[PDB]
Paper text:
The cyclic oligonucleotide-based antiphage signalling system ([name]) and the pyrimidine cyclase system for antiphage resistance (Pycsar) are antiphage defence systems in diverse bacteria that use cyclic nucleotide signals to induce cell death and prevent viral propagation. Here we show that phages encode anti-[name] (Acb) and anti-Pycsar (Apyc) proteins that counteract defence by specifically degrading cyclic nucleotide signals that activate host immunity. Using a biochemical screen of 57 phages in Escherichia coli and Bacillus subtilis, we discover Acb1 from phage T4 and [name] from phage SBSphiJ as founding members of distinct families of immune evasion proteins. We confirmed the critical role for [name] metal-coordinating residues and identified E74 and Y112 from the opposing protomer as further catalytic residues required for cCMP hydrolysis and release of the reaction product 5′-CMP. Together, these findings demonstrate that Acb1 and [name] constitute separate families of immune evasion proteins and explain the distinct reaction mechanisms that degrade [name] or Pycsar cyclic nucleotide signals.
To compare mechanisms of anti-[name] and anti-Pycsar evasion, we determined the crystal structure of [name] from the phage Bsp38 (2.7 Å) as well as structures of Paenibacillus [name] proteins (1.5 Å and 1.8 Å). Structures of [name] reveal a metal-dependent cyclic NMP phosphodiesterase that uses relaxed specificity to target Pycsar cyclic pyrimidine mononucleotide signals. We identified 107 proteins related to [name] present in phage genomes and also found many closely related bacterial proteins encoded in diverse bacterial orders. Similar to SBSphiJ [name], closely related phage and bacterial [name]-like proteins cleaved cyclic mononucleotides with broad specificity. The observation of [name] homologues encoded in bacteria may be explained by the presence of cryptic prophages present in bacterial genomes, but also raises the intriguing possibility that host [name] enzymes may play a role in regulating Pycsar defence or other cNMP-based signalling systems. Structural comparison of [name] and B. subtilis YhfI also reveals that [name] enzymes contain an extended loop that reaches into the nucleotide-binding pocket, potentially enabling stable binding of smaller cyclic pyrimidine substrates.
Residue numbers in the entry:
A (entry chain B): 3 to 248
B (entry chain A): 1 to 248
Write the structure that this text describes.
C-alpha cells in the first residue's frame, strides 16, 4: 500500500494541514480522517473529492471530522455521487447526532441522517475488515481523550497507524515483535508535558529496533527544530507518497 | 456610531482562494468576530490577530464556514490562555449549536466539560431586539432566509450597517433599508453562478435600483469573483483583509 499525508500537523498547526492520510491500495483511495483542512489540502494536491472511494474516521475532533460537511454538500449537489464513510461502531451515532447534524440536517429536503449523504459503513473493533480486495483495516482502541472513543488502525497487517494516541510502550514493543506490522506511523507531540498525545521524549524511550519502524506525524509547527533530534525515527514529509512493501 | 469591519475571509462556503466569510468588527475598543468558520483560526493567524484579542464571537447560522473554527478557539482559550470570551448566539440556535454541532468534539465529561458555557460566556440573543454588546456597539438580529426550515440571521450594526450574512435575495427588504434610514451601508451575500437557490445572486442584486446598489458591497463570493470586477453595477466586491470604515 501507499500513504500520502495530505496534512501532517497537530490540531492547530498553521504550517501543516490536519493529520489526514490518503491511502492508496489496489486502485482504492481511502482518506483516513477528514479535518477542517482536508478539502483545501486535497484541492492543493489536485485530488478531486470524486476520487475518494471512502473516508474512515478515527475519533471526533475538528481536525478529523470538520471537513466532512464540505465533502457531503459537494458530493450531493455538485457531483451526485455516493462514497463510503467508514465509522467505528461506537462513533456512528455521536458523529451525526452531536457533530455533523447541525450543519447537514435539512429536514425539508428529506436529509435527516448521515446515510442521506454517504454510504455509512459501521466497523466493529477487533475485527478485520476487507474494505476493498487487498485492503484490510483493523480498529484498535486507542487512548486519547479519557472517556471518548478513539481508534488506531492496522492496515493490511503491515502498517500500524496510531492516529491520535497516548504513548503505550508495551503495545508498541509488542507490535515490533509480534509480526503484526512492519511500519508504525505515530502521533508525536513536540512540547512537554504528556497529556493526551504521545510525546517525542516518550517515543525516544523506545528501543532502537522499534524506533527504526516509526515515522512521526500529527506534529506542531516547530517540527523543523527536531529534524535529526528524533533518534532513529523520522518525521513524515507532508504530501510525500510513501510505499510500504510486504 | 462609527465602526470598522475587516473581513478575515470573503468567500463562499467552499471557495479555495478566499477564506470563509467571517467579519472582524472593531468599535470603541471592542473586537467582535461575526462567524467563526473552519478557516477563521488560519485567517486570524495570517493577519497576526491573536485569538486573545477577540472579545466575542457572534454566530449567524450553523454551517461549517460559520461554526467550524469554534472548537479550536475553545480549546486554545481554555488550555493555552485560560481566557473566557463571549459567544453571542441567536436564542433559537443556542441549543442546536452545542447539541448537534460542537458537543461531539468539545464534550469532555471526565473533566466536567459538559456544556458550551464551560468554554465561553454564552450570551443568548433574542431576535428583533437591539442588543448593546459594548458601549457604542449595537447588534439587532433580523431573521434571514437561507436554508428553509433552519434558523439563520442577518444583522443590523449600530443602526448603520446591514450585514446580510448568508441570505436569499429580498428586493423589498433591501429597498426598505435604503429608504427607512435604518442603514447607510449594506454588505450582502453574492452568489456569482446561476441559478438562485439559497443565496442572493449577482443578477438578482443587479435588479435593485441604482440608489440601493450604491449602498452595497458584495461578500460570500466564489473563486471567480475577479471575473466580475467592474461588472457589478454600482456595487463592488469587498476586498479580503481590507479594513473598511463606516460613519454617520
Ligand atoms: Zn488530532
Ligand atoms: Zn484528537
Ligand atoms: Zn456560508
Ligand atoms: Zn450557510
Amino acid at each position: 500500500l501507499q500513504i500520502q499525508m495530505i496534512g501532517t500537523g497537530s490540531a492547530f498547526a498553521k504550517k501543516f494541514y490536519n493529520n489526514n492520510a490518503l491511502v492508496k491500495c489496489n486502485g482504492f483511495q481511502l482518506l483516513i480522517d477528514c479535518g477542517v483542512t482536508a478539502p483545501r489540502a486535497l484541492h492543493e494536491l489536485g485530488v478531486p473529492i470524486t476520487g475518494i472511494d471512502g473516508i474512515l474516521i478515527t475519533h471526533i475532533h475538528a481536525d478529523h471530522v470538520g471537513g466532512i460537511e464540505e465533502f457531503a454538500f459537494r458530493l450531493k449537489y455538485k457531483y451526485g455521487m455516493t462514497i463510503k464513510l467508514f465509522v467505528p461502531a461506537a462513533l456512528v451515532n455521536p458523529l451525526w447526532d452531536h457533530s455533523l447534524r447541525g450543519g447537514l440536517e435539512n429536514k425539508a429536503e428529506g436529509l435527516e441522517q448521515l446515510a442521506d449523504y454517504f454510504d455509512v459503513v459501521a466497523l466493529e473493533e477487533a475485527v478485520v475488515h476487507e474494505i476493498h480486495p487487498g485492503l484490510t483495516v483493523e480498529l484498535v482502541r486507542s487512548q486519547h481523550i479519557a472517556g471518548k472513543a478513539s481508534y488506531s488502525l492496522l492496515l493490511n497487517n503491515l502498517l500500524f497507524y496510531s492516529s491520535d494516541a497516548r504513548f503505550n510502550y508495551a503495545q508498541l514493543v509488542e507490535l515490533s515483535t509480534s509480526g503484526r506490522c512492519k511500519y508504525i506511523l505515530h502521533d508525536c507531540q513536540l512540547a512537554e508535558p504528556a497529556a493526551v498525545h504521545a510525546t517525542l521524549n516518550e517515543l525516544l524511550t523506545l528501543p532502537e529496533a522499534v524506533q527504526e519502524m516509526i515515522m512521526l506525524m500529527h506534529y506542531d509547527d516547530e517540527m523543523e527544530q527536531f529534524i535529526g533530534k528524533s533518534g532513529k525515527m523520522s518525521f513524515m514529509q507532508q504530501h510525500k507518497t510513501y510505499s510500504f512493501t510486504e
